[PDB]
Amino acid sequence: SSWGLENEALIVRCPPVEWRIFVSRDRLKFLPARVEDSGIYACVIRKTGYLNVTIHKKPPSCNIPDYLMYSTVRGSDKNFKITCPTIDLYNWTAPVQWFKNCKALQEPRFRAHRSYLFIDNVTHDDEGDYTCQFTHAENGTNYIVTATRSFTVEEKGFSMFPVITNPPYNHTMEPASIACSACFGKGSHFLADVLWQINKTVVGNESSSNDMDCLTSVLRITGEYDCLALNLHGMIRHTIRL
């Protein structure tokens, strides 16, 4: 599927190529795009593919509906950058113009660089639907292009290389119980696990003065022992013997 607004340029990619509407190398171009040509187009390589293109009438209201927006950007206070979708198919030049809820972003707070928009001092109040607009130049004629995606801002929290609090590095303990605890920072974690390894393979309530996010796996064998902590930063092992 592909979509675009009418009287705007539209250029599409299909997965020795054969297909007002032009074609250059392997790409199909609408300059300008008009609602009549919205259909299903076929591409051949000498082996084929199709996509359904839809051309739309410029939205009546400023709030654009969901079906002409691109994938949502789940941003944070640590990733306040929005990319302009599809822009590298066109022959475009800086600067790209940005809008939020149909209003021009003109500030030092909103910085445009290559295909990106950076929001300084980002806050939850900067959530909403952003429209990039740029120009595609072809044979002296400039055709305009816009794309829209929505953008949210969650307050992240940080992460660190895991730290095992117990058991200690070089220990030995004499119905048996040993707890493996680690802390990973404070925040939201994509992956964070603590586990026990018996002979280097996986086996198969009160806390310290820490604000950090800590996990504990208690190994109890009711009758080399490795304590492992891992996240995307890496994995650390403390080995215990008895």
């Binding site: 949502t72 290389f161 994509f190 994995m235």
Partner: protein, 146 residues
């Protein structure tokens, strides 16, 4: 020596989606909002690389991943030794393992274990093996979301 498995969707630094197409090839492009994107199963192991600055005295190591589509779990992201491409291929070899670097709060990098110094990066809406360079570091940065 498998540690953990976890499904996740892969996006690019430039907010584009990576997809696996039926009759399998890799694709990198933007998608419509609320269009369900493909997922991949990541298997995490202990790599031989030092956790670069795990701290003074701590013998940290980085993790090592291999990736599968959730639709079929015996297909692997495989790095070509002399063709420098990332392709899906059908007990995986060292060509399907990638050392995982955490590069920012939201993006990671996959250095090919089979060919040290080269990472998975997006090239012409595909996956290729490239080098990390400051001007174009965004090539090799990927976001893992659940």
């Amino acid at each position: 020596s498998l540690l953990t498995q976890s499904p996740a969707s892969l996006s690019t630094y430039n907010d584009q989606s990576v997809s696996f197409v039926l009759e399998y090839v890799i694709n990198v492009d933007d998608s419509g909002k609320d269009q369900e994107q493909d997922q991949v199963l990541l298997r995490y192991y202990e790599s031989p690389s030092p956790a670069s600055q795990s701290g003074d005295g701590v013998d940290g190591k980085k993790l090592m991943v291999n990736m599968s589509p959730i639709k079929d779990t015996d297909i692997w992201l495989h790095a070509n030794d002399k063709d420098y491409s990332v392709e899906l291929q059908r007990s995986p070899p060292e060509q399907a393992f990638f050392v995982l670097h955490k590069k920012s709060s939201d993006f990671v990098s996959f250095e090919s274990k089979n060919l040290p110094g080269t990472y998975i990066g997006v090239k012409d809406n595909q996956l290729a093996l490239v080098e990390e360079k400051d001007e174009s570091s965004n090539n090799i940065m990927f976001k893992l979301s659940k």
